Design a protein around this ligand. Structure first.
Ligand SMILES: C[C@H](CS)C(=O)N1CCC[C@H]1C(=O)O
Ligand SMILES: [Zn+2]
Length: 598
């Protein structure tokens, strides 16, 4: 019998019913009120029951024996019930606990280090600016400590029941745990190992940047503050979680003398605005014959932090309302070079949305979560190059010295190479929890030992099992899988390298056309490749989506390394010239107790 009629009917409903859920999720996250929180959870509970019933109806159709896939593909996916598999009581309890951590994160406020009266400083604007600009280790320590105690510790209990229900829901779907359930999204039994492999190839590179940054930081802050051979004290790497270090390029770039690609201040001087930035981002896509932003986007998107005293979630995000042309972004945008990439990052999501609207709801997602987080980053890479920044006048007079090129790759290494091990630890940690590998009595150290092993970083002050820091990371609090980023930072280079080749910008043979300097801006063959891939949306396992992009079907490290080759070689020499220590000894920042009040 034909269920193509069934599925078509059903997807159309799901897309209708998810629309409702999406408007409540979006109202909440634009204005955190209990009422909005209640409506939001209400809708999901409702949707959850529909799914349960929709799931039992499919027992009618024995698709495990059907003929054509796609159809046979839509059932395997529509019957994979996530948290909705949980009985009524638990699903609701999960939503509550899930709401608790999300709003706790977003509602954090600390008191200004030099004015204990204020206490209205928030993470997005204020704190992120301090961690990023201050050069007083004691002040960055203050803000580190103040933020991790509120954002992580305060929500340890909820986080524990979250893992419990997460696990419960995963066994309810025939998965080993929540861990193996996330991995399933990549449809490949050897995925984790492929990633463990690639990380190994780039690690050596990671351990040359590490010792170097540590060299300057220690030269700048001093021996007493940063020690040689020891892991790098966070709070000093310019990022609350140390996932990216570009913010401290003013003190660790090898050539601050040679032009620094810091368009950030030339932006502010030119009166750049959030709106202008989105429009610039709209341009790149249309330049590539990609789809232009629809009218609902400019009408509904929130692109600047609301000015009232209301609470909201401001960790940038893009929304697919599952209709036709109703896509919106919510960003607390600021005029700075990092935010500029972010806009593009977000538009990468929007693009994908538009690219697969026609697809049956079930397939309206990304081929492999990795693909979703990479689109917009590929354009960002182009925008970051001297070529494209001069072309738009955000870099007046610039000379490609040679040692100016080193900066152009080094400033990129702090966000792209450096990130690889951070994102890997994020899920390795949550995987070890989902799997019963760790004892609740060691939950907070496993996280730090893990930040130690892979990143060589440690907290500003001693923490203990009394604290719980993992939740200080938005995604841990909001339950958002993180492996998608690791995969993105790898393959986004695979995309970029092919785009530039299809575009007349990259030639491996001769020079004058180096990978780190193509712009693909205005490239039609590029957007073309980007259309064959995006338009598919989950309709096929990812090896097929990629193959639609460049004929290849494998994920590899042959992209970042080739891109950062000139940097890697420049460092080895430099590290011997300065006698720079490589590698680090285990950390002494995870313990338990100890006070001097007798
Ligand atoms: C806003 C995006 C997701 S749409 C995000 O969370 N990113 C982008 C890069 C890293 C990571 C982060 O902020 O931790
Ligand atoms: Zn994203």
């Amino acid at each position: 019998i034909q269920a193509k009629e069934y599925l078509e009917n059903l997807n159309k409903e799901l897309a209708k019913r998810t629309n409702v859920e999406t408007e409540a999720a979006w109202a909440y996250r634009s204005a955190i009120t209990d009422e909005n929180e209640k409506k939001k959870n209400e809708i999901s509970a409702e949707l959850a029951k529909f799914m349960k019933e929709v799931a039992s109806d499919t027992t009618k159709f024995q698709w495990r024996s059907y003929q054509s896939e796609d159809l046979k593909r839509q059932f395997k996916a529509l019957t994979k019930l996530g948290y909705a598999a949980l009985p009524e009581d638990d699903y609701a309890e999960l939503l509550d606990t899930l709401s608790a951590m999300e709003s706790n994160f977003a509602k954090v406020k600390v008191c200004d280090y030099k004015d204990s009266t204020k206490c209205d400083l928030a993470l997005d604007p204020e704190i992120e600016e301090v961690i990023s600009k201050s050069r007083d280790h004691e002040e960055l320590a203050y803000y580190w400590r103040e933020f991790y105690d509120k954002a992580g510790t305060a929500v340890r209990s909820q986080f524990e029941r979250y893992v419990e229900l997460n696990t419960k829901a995963a066994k309810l779907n025939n998965f080993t745990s929540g861990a193996e359930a996330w991995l399933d999204e990549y449809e490949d039994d050897t995925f984790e190992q492929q990633l463990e492999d690639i990380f190994a190839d780039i690690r050596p590179l990671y351990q040359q940047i590490h010792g170097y940054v540590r060299f300057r930081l220690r030269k700048h802050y001093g021996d007493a503050v940063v020690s040689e051979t020891g892991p790098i004290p966070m709070h000093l790497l310019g990022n609350m979680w140390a996932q990216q270090w570009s913010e401290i390029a003013d003190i660790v770039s090898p050539f601050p003398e040679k032009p620094l690609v810091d368009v950030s201040a030339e932006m502010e001087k030119q009166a750049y605005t959030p709106l202008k930035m989105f429009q610039m981002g709209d341009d790149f896509f249309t330049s590539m014959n990609l789809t232009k932003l629809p009218q609902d986007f400019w009408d509904k998107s929130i692109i600047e932090k609301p000015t009232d005293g209301r609470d909201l979630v401001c960790h940038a995000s893009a929304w697919d309302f599952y209709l036709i042309d109703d896509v919106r972004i919510k960003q607390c945008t600021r005029v700075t070079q990092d935010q500029l990439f972010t806009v593009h990052h977000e538009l990468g999501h929007i693009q994908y949305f538009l690219q697969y609207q026609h697809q049956p709801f079930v397939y309206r997602t990304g081929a492999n979560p990795g693909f979703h987080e990479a689109v917009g980053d590929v354009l960002s890479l182009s925008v970051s190059t001297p070529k494209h920044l001069e072309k738009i006048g955000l870099l007046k007079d610039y000379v490609r010295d040679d040692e100016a090129r080193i900066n152009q790759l080094f400033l990129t290494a702090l966000d792209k190479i450096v990130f690889l091990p951070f994102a890997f630890t994020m899920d390795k940690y949550r995987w070890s929890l989902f799997r019963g590998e760790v004892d609740k009595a060691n939950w907070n150290c496993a996280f730090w030992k893990l930040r130690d092993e892979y990143s060589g970083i440690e907290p500003p002050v001693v923490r203990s099992e009394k604290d719980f820091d993992a939740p200080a990371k938005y995604h841990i609090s909001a339950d958002v899988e993180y492996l998608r980023y690791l995969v993105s930072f790898i393959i986004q280079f695979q995309f970029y390298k092919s785009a530039c080749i299809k575009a007349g910008q990259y030639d491996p043979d001769n020079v004058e056309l180096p990978l780190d300097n193509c712009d693909i801006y205005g490239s039609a063959r590029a957007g073309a490749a980007f259309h064959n891939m995006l338009s598919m949306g989950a309709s096929k396992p990812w090896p097929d989506a990629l193959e639609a992009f460049n004929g290849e079907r494998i994920m590899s490290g042959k992209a970042i390394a080739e891109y950062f080759e000139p940097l890697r070689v420049w460092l080895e020499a430099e590290n011997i010239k300065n006698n720079v220590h490589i590698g680090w000894i285990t950390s002494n920042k995870c313990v338990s107790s100890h006070h001097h009040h007798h």
